[PDB]
Amino acid sequence: MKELKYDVLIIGGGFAGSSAAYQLSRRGLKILLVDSKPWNRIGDKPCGDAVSKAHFDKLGMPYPKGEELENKINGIKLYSPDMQTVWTVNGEGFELNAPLYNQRVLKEAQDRGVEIWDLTTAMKPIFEDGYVKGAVLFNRRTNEELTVYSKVVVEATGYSRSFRSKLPPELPITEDLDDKDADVAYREVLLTKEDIEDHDYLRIFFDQETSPGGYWWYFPKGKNKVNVGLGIQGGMGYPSIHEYYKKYLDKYAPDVDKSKLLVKGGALVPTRRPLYTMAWNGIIVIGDSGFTVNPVHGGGKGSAMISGYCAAKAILSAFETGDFSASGLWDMNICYVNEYGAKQASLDIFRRFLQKLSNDDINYGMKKKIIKEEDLHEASEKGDLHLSVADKAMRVISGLGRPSLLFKLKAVAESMKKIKELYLNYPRSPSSLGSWRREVDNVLTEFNKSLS
Numbered sequence: 001m002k003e004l005k006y007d008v009l010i011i012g013g014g015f016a017g018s019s020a021a022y023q024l025s026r027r028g029l030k031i032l033l034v035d036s037k038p039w040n041r042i043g044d045k046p047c048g049d050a051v052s053k054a055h056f057d058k059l060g061m062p063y064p065k066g067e068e069l070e071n072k073i074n075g076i077k078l079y080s081p082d083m084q085t086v087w088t089v090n091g092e093g094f095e096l097n098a099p100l101y102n103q104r105v106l107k108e109a110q111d112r113g114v115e116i117w118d119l120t121t122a123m124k125p126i127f128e129d130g131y132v133k134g135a136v137l138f139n140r141r142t143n144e145e146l147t148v149y150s151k152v153v154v155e156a157t158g159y160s161r162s163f164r165s166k167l168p169p170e171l172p173i174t175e176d177l178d179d180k181d182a183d184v185a186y187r188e189v190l191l192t193k194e195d196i197e198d199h200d201y202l203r204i205f206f207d208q209e210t211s212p213g214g215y216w217w218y219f220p221k222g223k224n225k226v227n228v229g230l231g232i233q234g235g236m237g238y239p240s241i242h243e244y245y246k247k248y249l250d251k252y253a254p255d256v257d258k259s260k261l262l263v264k265g266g267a268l269v270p271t272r273r274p275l276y277t278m279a280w281n282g283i284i285v286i287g288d289s290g291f292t293v294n295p296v297h298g299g300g301k302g303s304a305m306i307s308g309y310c311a312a313k314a315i316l317s318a319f320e321t322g323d324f325s326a327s328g329l330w331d332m333n334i335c336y337v338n339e340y341g342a343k344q345a346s347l348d349i350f351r352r353f354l355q356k357l358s359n360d361d362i363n364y365g366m367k368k369k370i371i372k373e374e375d376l377h378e379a380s381e382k383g384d385l386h387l388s389v390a391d392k393a394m395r396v397i398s399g400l401g402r403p404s405l406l407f408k409l410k411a412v413a414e415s416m417k418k419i420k421e422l423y424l425n426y427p428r429s430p431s432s433l434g435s436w437r438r439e440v441d442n443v444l445t446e447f448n449k450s451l452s
């Protein structure tokens with residue numbers, strides 16, 4: 001078959017893959033990006049389409065404009081199980097036309113010298129001499145089966161992780177996902193009968209009965225269009241998520257016109273710390289494939305762009321040293337962990353605590369204001385549950401006269417603090433990965449027991 005040689009092969013053109021291509025463009029490298037979907041459908045995976053504005057600023061990513069920006073977000077209203085207490089969190093964000101923006105990022109990267117092949121699937125990984133040296137592609141637009149060699153393969157295949165899963169199981173880069181470390185999520189976009197009240201605000205409904213292990217959401221895409229859906233924890237034996245959706249839709253979205261359905265569908269969402277290493281010999285993994293999703297609220301498009309940035313940084317370093325080993329690509333880990341990874345690890349622990357709380361716990365916690373918005377902002381943005389804040393909440397929880405998991409909040413804050421410092425001390429070399437990883441596991445397995 002035909003053989004082509006590139007510097008970098010990016011597999012997957014999602015938020016992760018497109019950002020990696022964008023950040024790498026116009027810097028002396030020959031890049032090829034492939035995606036199984038046709039160009040017009042790239043980036044249409046079922047999503048809430050809600051991304052923070054802060055993510056676009058930090059990475060120097062182009063703002064969504066025109067048709068790419070369906071609705072400006074100014075904050076989030078989150079509700080209690082009994083709908084009695086409503087917290088409001090202010091902050092600017094965007095309700096996106098995800099495929100439209102995703103395709104502009106691709107188009108711009110293409111204008112910057114990056115070659116993009118749509119309708120192309122990476123079938124078989126080229127693994128020779130202990131290294132990832134490319135992949136076998138199938139371009140069904142030209143019906144070709146090409147062999148593409150590369151110094152670095154960027155794995156950005158989403159939750160399916162279809163490429164790296166076909167690699168030898170001895171590679172740390174083939175770490176799989178535990179069922180309970182993921183949520184299944186489903187959403188629909190409908191037009192509403194009446195105009196949406198406070199359409200510049202997102203709505204999040206916490207309820208362990210209507211969405212166990214997750215939550216419901218009401219994300220307005222305009223004055224009369226809303227993205228409504230839910231997420232539940234996998235590997236728990238819960239019935240189909242569409243059963244939960246069909247049963248409790250009217251509670252969280254009574255205003256929607258069910259005869260004006262636009263899109264529908266669902267997918268898997270990783271809710272854990274990232275891969276213990278996101279880089280190995282001749283390969284870097286980003287996006288959902290590298291578990292870059294926020295463990296608490298499930299947002300992963302912002303952190304996918306971040307992983308793409310760090311992937312671009314590490315690859316440029318690898319070429320300047322001519323070293324494409326795990327050691328030569330190790331900056332991928334150091335960069336991402338400092339940017340979002342260390343936060344994920346801390347929120348991984350906090351997630352496990354939240355998922356086991358009862359509706360009575362959440363109702364009491366929100367009504368009695370165990371934390372204020374000042375520390376809530378500090379939480380899901382820095383991953384820090386300050387010990388002074390936990391103490392302030394525990395004094396309120398002390399007023400509870402019934403048994404509850406809330407009484408372990410201080411111990412949770414200490415475990416979060418512990419694993420946070422552990423990730424900030426991420427191994428400087430691949431030869432320390434095994435030792436560090438087992439220490440992380442010990443922290444987690446210990447914590448799982450402390451919640452009982």
Ligand SMILES: Cc1cc2c(cc1C)N(C[C@H](O)[C@H](O)[C@H](O)COP(=O)(O)OP(=O)(O)OC[C@H]1O[C@@H](n3cnc4c(N)ncnc43)[C@H](O)[C@@H]1O)c1[nH]c(=O)[nH]c(=O)c1N2
Nearest residue numbers: 012014015016035036047048050122157158287288300301
């Ligand atoms: C229902 C629901 C709701 C939400 C969310 C998820 C889900 C399922 N998320 C998470 C967010 O959707 C997700 O984390 C990001 O899209 C991750 O971007 P990726 O590019 O890694 O994935 P993505 O799946 O988009 O990328 C995979 C791409 O690679 C291609 N591909 C795969 N295998 C291939 C192969 N072998 N060869 C070629 N191409 C291949 C696929 O065709 C696809 O284009 C979210 N996030 C957020 O920030 N806020 C939100 O509101 C939500 N809400």
Ligand SMILES: CC(C)=CCC/C(C)=C/CC/C(C)=C/CC/C(C)=C/COP(=O)(O)OP(=O)(O)O
Nearest residue numbers: 048050051052054090091092093094297298299
């Ligand atoms: C539904 C699933 C699976 C995930 C949803 C993921 C979420 C909640 C995304 C929300 C992103 C968004 C539009 C946030 C806007 C509101 C907000 C609190 C933004 C916080 O970001 P910053 O802009 O940094 O906040 P500040 O600058 O105000 O501190």
